[PDB]
């Protein structure tokens, strides 16, 4: 990444305070609600007819935890997101057929979730470092598309 040690520490430190379970379910859910077209990939999850039906859907919550899970592990390889996500990049392209643009929407949604949760703690500078991280992650995941 083009993260400053200081930027690295900011990211790392906030993340330590994160409940992946709750943040993961919430990020994915907000995604399906704010950008309804992303539901195209989760038909099999059930009723996503309402914010309420989405937010409460257990399959959604659980997929969210799997996603933030992998994201979490990527924060341990911030100097090689590319190599960390290569297998997952090919999977997303060749098996799942997920448009790379979705990686970008999720990123922004993630930042809104973190701000929501940490309030005061999620300062402009901390946000700036997280924007750099979501961008990098999004780039790594779309890296093997062909």
């Amino acid at each position: 990444m083009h993260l400053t040690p200081e930027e690295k520490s900011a990211v790392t430190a906030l993340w330590g305070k994160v409940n992946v379970d709750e943040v993961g379910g919430e990020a994915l859910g907000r995604l399906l609600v704010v950008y309804p077209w992303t539901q195209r990939f989760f038909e099999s999850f059930g009723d996503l007819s309402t914010p309420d039906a989405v937010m409460g859907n257990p399959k959604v919550k659980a997929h969210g935890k799997k996603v933030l899970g992998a994201f979490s592990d990527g924060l341990a390889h911030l100097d090689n997101l590319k190599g960390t996500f290569a297998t997952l990049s090919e999977l997303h392209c060749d098996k799942l057929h997920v448009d790379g643009e979705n990686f970008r929407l999720l990123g922004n949604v993630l930042v809104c979730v973190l701000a929501h949760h940490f309030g005061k703690e999620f300062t402009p500078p901390v946000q700036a470092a997280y924007q750099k991280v979501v961008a990098g992650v999004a780039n790594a995941l779309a890296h093997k598309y062909h």
């Binding site: 992303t38 539901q39 195209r40 057929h97 997920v98 790379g100």
Partner: protein
């Protein structure tokens, strides 16, 4: 909004396309597949090889809709209603992809109508494709 000048420009350039619209729609697709691979995620079910009939078939469909929007330049929201619903409700193509195809259609036309692809026409065609894209994405949320 399209100006009278814009409208004239569009009918004129599309006018010259004529019978090749189908073929130009196919090439625009191929161009898009090759330059922006992420767009391919929407066609998992297609044979995307060069000269694929599926692509040929699809390009004709896209070209027909554009021809229909030119034919109804003063009532695009209504002439494209059905296609707007399809995209919003079934296909659910992320909006950024409209800009990508638009771009490849402009390249395609530029490559085929050198004498007509003037600065003024280029500007009008870009505004036009932007308008079609806006309509097609209007009922997304």
């Amino acid at each position: 909004v399209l100006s009278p000048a814009d409208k004239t420009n569009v009918k004129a350039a599309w006018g010259k396309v004529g019978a090749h619209a189908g073929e130009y729609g196919a090439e625009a697709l191929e161009r898009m597949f090759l330059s922006f691979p992420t767009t391919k995620t929407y066609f998992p079910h297609f044979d995307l090889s060069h000269g694929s009939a599926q692509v040929k078939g699809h390009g004709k469909k896209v070209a027909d809709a554009l021809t229909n929007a030119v034919a109804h330049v003063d009532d695009m929201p209504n002439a494209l209603s059905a296609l707007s619903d399809l995209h919003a409700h079934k296909l659910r193509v992320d909006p950024v992809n409209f800009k990508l195809l638009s771009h490849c259609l402009l390249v395609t036309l530029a490559a085929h109508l050198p004498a007509e692809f003037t600065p003024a026409v280029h500007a009008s065609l870009d505004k036009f494709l932007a308008s079609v894209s806006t309509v097609l994405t209007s009922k997304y949320r």
